[PDB]
Design a protein around this ligand. Sequence first.
Ligand SMILES: Cc1nc(C(=O)N2CCC[C@H]2Cc2nnc(-c3ccccc3)o2)c(-c2ccccc2F)s1
Length: 503
Amino acid sequence: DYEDEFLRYLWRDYLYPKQYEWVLIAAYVAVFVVALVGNTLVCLAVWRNHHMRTVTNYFIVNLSLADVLVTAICLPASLLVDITESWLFGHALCKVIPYLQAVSVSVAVLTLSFIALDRWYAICHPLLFKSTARRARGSILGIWAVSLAIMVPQAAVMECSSVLPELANRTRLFSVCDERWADDLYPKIYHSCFFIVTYLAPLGLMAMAYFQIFRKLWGRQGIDCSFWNESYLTGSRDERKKSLLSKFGMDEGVTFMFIGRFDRGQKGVDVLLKAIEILSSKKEFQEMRFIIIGKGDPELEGWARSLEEKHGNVKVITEMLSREFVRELYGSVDFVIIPSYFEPFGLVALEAMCLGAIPIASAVGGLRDIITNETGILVKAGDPGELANAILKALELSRSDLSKFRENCKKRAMSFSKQMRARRKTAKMLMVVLLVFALCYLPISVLNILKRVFGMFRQASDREAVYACFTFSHWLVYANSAANPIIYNFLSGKFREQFKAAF
Ligand SMILES: Cc1nc(C(=O)N2CCC[C@H]2Cc2nnc(-c3ccccc3)o2)c(-c2ccccc2F)s1
């Protein structure tokens, strides 16, 4: 009957110090300083500069503030508890510190969620993208408010235990801090809801969001603007056009080029051929030159070759070409025709535009994104008529200087490529941050959801090994705070510049 209290009476002074305590402390100290100077360096880096004041970076700042809170208040307490197995602070801090722990976790996760949502709208729904600084400094307050509000049961149930309840002998060596609930279903509910709210739902939703983002950004790395450069072409452009046409046995005229595999339902060379057939009449056809390059279906090649034989102003090339020569072609011709059906990337547009060629493309896929007004002509796909009309307009535009137009094409292509690259980078960084977060908060979450709902680690000598895993999980939790600034330092150039500048 009195076995528990007597065994506690015989073993109350039994201390069995862990061999590897100094490795814990060290780690805890490391993580401590690294989390401080790290996260502060983030805050400063955003606060001092004007170019660093992005919504994303404001969120990052909120995250760093939360992690700073954790590092300053919760880390030393956790170290002391994990190393002495006792609560050395007051009865009030017994409620305050774990509360702030929960709140901090909440704020962090929610902040990451707002980042992910922001990028999801930015990438996957450009037209609906709205991210003012007022939305940030206004939703962050919502995050802190909700976090502070929903974590009050944590503060409520925290109590400072000492010895077995209903025991007349209040004698003790040390006290502890743990959760004291009225019922037994209450812990299960609060902790299941805690696990779902602060880990399951947001990391799930964010996984989905970054899945859509990465699926949208896949295969879009841009082009090599070091190769596709007009600087490697000689002479003037009209001289290169005259030379090119003369080489094919043609007189000077407004030159249109096509290049791509011959498809009945993709690259739309058939639409082009039909368009040329449409243009076979009219008084404007002899002012035009057509260069059809590619290889594919025998029928389409026969069609193109027959048109080449029919008209003296149409040249068909089934010959395998070099990248340098294609580059020359883009920097000689006046217009490039991209009559694609579903073109998802549209690299020909970018390259041609980089080399001064003005694109005439079907307004589909990536071509819509790349080509705007003043930077090209857009056409309804699968419609030879509207294509022919666009070609006629291109002819009517060639009666002007067209220099600033080509320059606009260059600027457009370059800026587009750079934007997509930067996008790829930032998305990469945020994904890494999220991943590291998930990994860091995983073990303590499974251990917590096991301990507080599905049974517990409480029976017999199943504790002095569970203790180690628990302390490690805790340290990991605090280690995340030190992890984020390093990630920023290795995956964000501006943060690199700022970190380096701070010393
Ligand atoms: C040291 C830690 N304790 C926990 C933990 O079990 N809980 C329950 C819900 C939130 C957190 C709150 C808490 N309980 N004790 C402390 C504490 C804090 C400091 C010193 C001593 C005790 O903080 C941690 C935790 C668990 C899951 C998810 C996130 C967490 F932060 S970390």
